[PDB]
Design a protein around this ligand. Structure first.
Ligand code: CLR
Ligand code: CLR
Ligand code: CLR
Ligand code: A1IR1
Ligand code: OLA
Ligand code: OLA
Ligand code: OLA
Ligand code: OLA
Ligand code: OLA
Ligand code: OLA
Ligand code: OLA
Ligand code: OLA
Ligand code: OLA
Ligand code: OLA
Ligand code: OLA
Ligand code: OLA
Ligand code: OLA
Ligand code: OLA
Ligand code: OLA
Ligand code: OLA
Ligand code: NA
Length: 384
């Protein structure tokens, strides 16, 4: 069948993806620029990720369409148009890893987060990451390429000139680079590190939510131990543990000041052998628990639930990046490791390439569906 027919479907789909990738990701950058509630370190990496996706639409997709023609080109020029998408994918990986680490620092050390993670340090990391992405993605232009062994028969059959080759990705980019360096070292290892970071985020949230519920239950159990106590020493023992737990957990500041103070009043009575007076003093702790401690617990639980929801949204984007790119990397593994296997057919290569590009369309949707602040800002931009 005429090659222009199958190429026409692939090209049209690529162009449709390029349009959506630019539109949705420009909307993400617009929302962050306009709304100060979206201007935070996590979202500076989100914008770096959206910039990489805009460049997939503007440059990587036109370059993929160009390569698909097999046009005559100087081998090192062909190599640049083949490798530029690897720069963008690498930058995306560094942005996804930075978002995961950012979310881990926020849940593991919230009191140190604002002094450790600043906009200035974030902008420096993003700049370094873009430089490293160019170094990794354009490593073949440093000599790890097949330009020293051109397919001269294919070049002559196409009427190419001297120093020119038929420009095809797998003719100029070495497959040992694609599998060992690009896939295993530069993609799979950071994705596995991201999985490890997300497991630590969810374990930290789970442990912190369990600790809030345990401290609340301990307060209520110790209040009952005091109510049923048969002597001053038993009231004292339960109060000494209540005081330590209260200090460990320490209008919310006023509530904890009242709580420790009331435990201290009861403990002083219990040390004087005044059981009944110590038990009546301990009952006052219920008023403080109802008016202050319960509100603290509900707010701390709600804050942890919002961090779990946010880390899930971030993990879904990292997982969707893995889902969209893995097929092309896996096809490269078959081409490389199985020279006795027929190469994956051209229609399957086009499908894997288009699926990898579709990753540049999906993040604006995940932000709109899962993040209220982005959802409302997108609605305001599209309306105004
Ligand atoms: C800032 C942005 C918009 C600028 C983009 C510049 C792009 C389109 C330029 C920069 C380098 C260029 C390549 C350099 C060399 C060659 C080899 C030649 O035999 C065919 C064209 C080809 C393959 C060029 C295609 C266009 C190219 C990729
Ligand atoms: C990441 C998730 C979605 C899994 C993706 C798995 C895909 C990429 C796998 C599953 C089955 C695989 C195919 C199984 C058999 C062959 C025949 C061989 O001659 C060329 C490779 C080819 C055609 C494989 C290409 C990759 C393949 C299509
Ligand atoms: C955690 C997951 C996503 C990591 C990725 C797994 C990759 C590296 C695995 C999944 C299936 C594997 C392939 C399965 C079958 C074959 C055919 C054999 O003749 C050569 C090795 C080869 C081509 C394997 C290479 C590695 C492979 C592509
Ligand atoms: N094997 C492979 N091929 C490509 C790639 C990139 C752009 C265009 C084309 N193309 C066009 C027509 N036929 C092929 N192929 N990319 C990759 C790749 C990038 C990242 C991981 O694998 N692999
Ligand atoms: C080949 C074309 C150039 C390729 C590299 C382009 C890199 C563009 C990067 C932009 C991401 C910026 C994200 C926001 C940075 C933080 C802002 C701030 O806190 O001041
Ligand atoms: C901020 C914008 C960044 C733009 C891209 C920067 C990197 C461009 C890469 C250049 C590699 C140059 C390779 C030249 C090869 C010439 C041919 C040969 O030596 O045989
Ligand atoms: C979207 C699915 C189609 C993507 C492009 C594959 C075209 C394959 C072909 O018809 O040769
Ligand atoms: C966006 C879709 C534009 C399609 C234009 C024609 C492409 C083609 O058939 O080569
Ligand atoms: C690429 C497009 C990115 C869009 C966001 C920047 C211009 C700013 C105007 C204003 O602040 O009023
Ligand atoms: C393709 C290039 C995309 C450009 C990206 C820059 C967008 C800037 C929007 C976020 C600004 C954040 C801030 O000023 O703090
Ligand atoms: C908004 C700017 C970015 C988008 C630009 C789109 C340009 C058109 C898309 C495809 C790239 C051109 C393909 C040229 C193939 C040459 C084939 C040949 O020489 O045989
Ligand atoms: C900026 C937008 C760029 C759009 C086009 C992408 C690059 C196309 C390169 C085409 C090279 C054709 C050379 C030739 O015909 O020999
Ligand atoms: C969009 C306009 C068409 C882009 C593709 C031009 C090159 C087509 C081809 O020769 O296969
Ligand atoms: C051939 C390998 C060349 C490696 C270096 C190429 C140039 C890399 C620079 C690209 C972008 C620089 C940083 C821009 C984002 C800053 C965000 C604030
Ligand atoms: C660490 C990241 C460093 C990135 C910058 C690297 C600098 C050296 C790049 C050398 C490129 C020379 C062109 C290659 C060629 O012409 O064959
Ligand atoms: C991760 C480790 C990958 C090692 C691959 C070895 C393949 C081989 O030796 O043929
Ligand atoms: C290859 C695995 C890629 C995983 C990326 C991160 C997924 C995060 C999910 C955590 C549970
Ligand atoms: C664990 C993470 C994944 C590691 C995967 C390694 C794949 C190695 C495949 C080696 C194929 C060799 C085929 C041959 O001997 O001909
Ligand atoms: C992520 C999960 C990865 C998915 C698994 C990838 C491949 C699975 C099927 C492997 C078997 C293919 C054998 C082909 C043999 C042949 O063609 O001779
Ligand atoms: C939606 C449908 C997606 C189908 C894609 C992948 C499944 C496996 C297809 C393998 C076809 C190539 C086999 C071969 O001819 O060697
Ligand atoms: Na991306």
């Amino acid at each position: 069948a005429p090659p222009i027919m199958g190429s026409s479907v692939y090209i049209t789909v690529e162009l449709a993806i390029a349009v959506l990738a630019i539109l949705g990701n420009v909307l993400v950058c617009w929302a962050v620029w306009l709304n100060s509630n979206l201007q935070n370190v996590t979202n500076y990496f989100v914008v770096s990720l959206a910039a990489a996706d805009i460049l997939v639409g503007v440059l990587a997709i036109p370059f993929a369409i160009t390569i698909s023609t097999g046009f005559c080109a100087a081998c090192h020029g062909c190599l640049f148009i083949a490798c530029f998408v690897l720069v963008l994918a690498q930058s995306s990986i560094f942005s996804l890893l930075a978002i995961a680490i950012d979310r881990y620092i926020a849940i593991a050390i919230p009191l140190r987060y604002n002094g450790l993670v600043t906009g200035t340090r974030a902008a420096g990391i993003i700049a370094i990451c873009w430089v490293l992405s160019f170094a990794i993605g354009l490593t073949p232009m440093l000599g790890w390429n097949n330009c020293g062994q051109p397919k001269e028969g294919k070049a002559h059959s196409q009427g190419c000139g001297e120093g020119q080759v038929a420009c095809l990705f797998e003719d100029v980019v070495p497959m040992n680079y694609m599998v060992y360096f690009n896939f295993f070292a530069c993609v799979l290892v950071p994705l596995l590190l991201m999985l490890g970071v997300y497991l630590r985020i969810f374990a930290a949230a789970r442990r912190q939510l369990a600790d809030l519920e345990d401290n609340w239950e301990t307060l209520n159990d110790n209040l009952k131990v005091i109510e049923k106590a048969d002597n001053a020493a038993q009231v004292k023992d339960a109060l000494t543990k209540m005081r330590a737990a209260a200090l460990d957990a320490q209008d919310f500041r006023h509530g904890f000041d009242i709580l420790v103070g009331q435990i201290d009043d009861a403990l002083k009575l219990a040390n004087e052998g005044k059981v009944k007076e110590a038990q009546a003093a301990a009952e006052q702790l219920k008023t403080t628990r109802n008016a202050y401690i319960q509100k603290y617990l509900e707010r701390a639980r709600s804050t942890l639930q919002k961090e779990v929801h946010a880390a899930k949204s971030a993990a879904i984007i990292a997982g969707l990046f893995a889902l969209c790119w893995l097929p092309l990397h896996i096809i490269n593994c078959f081409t490389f490791f199985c020279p006795d296997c027929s190469h994956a057919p051209l229609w399957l290569m086009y499908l894997a390439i288009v699926l990898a590009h579709t990753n540049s369309v999906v993040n604006p949707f995940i932000y709109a569906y899962r993040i209220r602040e982005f959802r409302q800002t997108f609605r305001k931009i599209i309306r105004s």
